[PDB]
Amino acid sequence: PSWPQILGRLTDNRDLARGQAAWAMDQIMTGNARPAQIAAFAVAMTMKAPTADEVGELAGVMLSHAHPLPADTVPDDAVDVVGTGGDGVNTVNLSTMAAIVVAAAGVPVVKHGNRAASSLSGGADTLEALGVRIDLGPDLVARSLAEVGIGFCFAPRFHPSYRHAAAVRREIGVPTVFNLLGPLTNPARPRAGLIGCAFADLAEVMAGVFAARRSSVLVVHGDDGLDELTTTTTSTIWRVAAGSVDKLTFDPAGFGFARAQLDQLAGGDAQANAAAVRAVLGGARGPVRDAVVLNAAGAIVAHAGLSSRAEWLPAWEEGLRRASAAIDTGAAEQLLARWVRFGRQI
Numbered sequence: 001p002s003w004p005q006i007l008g009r010l011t012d013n014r015d016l017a018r019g020q021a022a023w024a025m026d027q028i029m030t031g032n033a034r035p036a037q038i039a040a041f042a043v044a045m046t047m048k049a050p051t052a053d054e055v056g057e058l059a060g061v062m063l064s065h066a067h068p069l070p071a072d073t074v075p076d077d078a079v080d081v082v083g084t085g086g087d088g089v090n091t092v093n094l095s096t097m098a099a100i101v102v103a104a105a106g107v108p109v110v111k112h113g114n115r116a117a118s119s120l121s122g123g124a125d126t127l128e129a130l131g132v133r134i135d136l137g138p139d140l141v142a143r144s145l146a147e148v149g150i151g152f153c154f155a156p157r158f159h160p161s162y163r164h165a166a167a168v169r170r171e172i173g174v175p176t177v178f179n180l181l182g183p184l185t186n187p188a189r190p191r192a193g194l195i196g197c198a199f200a201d202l203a204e205v206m207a208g209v210f211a212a213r214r215s216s217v218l219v220v221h222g223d224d225g226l227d228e229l230t231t232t233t234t235s236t237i238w239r240v241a242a243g244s245v246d247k248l249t250f251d252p253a254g255f256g257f258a259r260a261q262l263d264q265l266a267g268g269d270a271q272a273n274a275a276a277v278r279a280v281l282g283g284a285r286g287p288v289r290d291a292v293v294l295n296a297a298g299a300i301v302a303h304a305g306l307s308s309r310a311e312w313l314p315a316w317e318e319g320l321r322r323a324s325a326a327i328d329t330g331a332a333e334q335l336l337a338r339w340v341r342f343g344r345q346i
């Protein structure tokens with residue numbers, strides 16, 4: 001492949017041929033691209049409708065340059081709970097709340113992430129405000145997992161940057177498709193996940209890449225535009241299991257959830273979010289606790305999906321019950337406290 005060949009295909013409004021997105025992303029990752037080639041490719045790839053073949057290639061290459069966790073340190077049934085973000089709603093850190101609740105229910109959670117992209121407070125900022133050590137290395141993430149039930153892979157720590165990245169990001173000033181692939185590049189490679197996507201067309205595509213990984217994932221988009229399962233309206237779920245994709249509309253009303261408003265699910269900065277967490281984990285009832293329950297239960301359903309004999313409404317009932325129980329028994333609050341102690345004693 002070559003730059004003019006790939007770049008010309010893109011400016012011609014064609015999809016890339018097999019191997020070209022990978023070759024391109026790998027030239028960038030090994031320090032073989034000029035800033036103009038980098039910016040051109042990334043931008044053109046942010047504008048063209050995504051496909052599963054190109055997206056799998058970009059993510060596959062990125063994931064090959066990531067730092068793995070030590071051998072046999074990720075349980076088979078580990079889950080991620082993570083969104084692309086990019087949904088411009090500035091919500092309350094639903095994912096990180098759900099992740100603690102999932103882990104407190106007993107399902108291993110290995111998440112990655114970073115600081116906010118455009119939100120007031122990203123999951124990582126919010127963890128940090130709660131006292132949680134965001135910057136552990138592959139060894140201590142693996143001990144976190146083993147001794148707390150949850151580990152957090154900080155993105156800058158697990159994914160190398162590339163030559164010219166700071167100049168390019170500065171100069172272009174916008175996120176690109178390079179920034180939307182996180183769900184697909186978790187360094188621990190959990191096989192289960194609740195994956196929220198702000199862009200429906202990217203989500204469906206990402207559901208196909210997961211499907212081929214044999215992962216058990218619910219890829220989710222609020223029909224209100226949330227990158228989470230929403231309590232405001234229905235959501236679209238691309239339920240991935242046994243190598244196939246089952247796209248369906250989901251209404252949490254089928255399980256007794258009251259309709260909320262977007263306003264009620266809104267976040268603030270890292271302290272405001274850190275306090276919203278303590279409230280929910282301490283028992284505060286309301287629209288936020290509900291959205292947390294719902295997405296936690298979703299992740300538990302993705303987890304149930306690792307057995308071929310999972311049934312949907314029973315997985316869900318059991319997920320809602322386990323997520324609510326984790327809050328109400330104090331398990332989630334006790335886990336957060338344990339997570340804070342862990343990092344402090346190194």
Ligand SMILES: O=P(O)(O)OC[C@H]1O[C@H](OP(=O)(O)OP(=O)(O)O)[C@H](O)[C@@H]1O
Binds near residue numbers: 083096124
């Ligand atoms: O700034 P934005 O582009 O809106 O994105 C907000 C955050 O959401 C994503 O993570 P995740 O889904 O894990 O975070 P959450 O806990 O806030 O849902 C991403 O890692 C950001 O940290």
Ligand SMILES: [Mg+2]
Binds near residue numbers: 083085094096196228
């Ligand atoms: Mg999220």
Ligand SMILES: [Mg+2]
Binds near residue numbers: 083085087095196
């Ligand atoms: Mg979100």
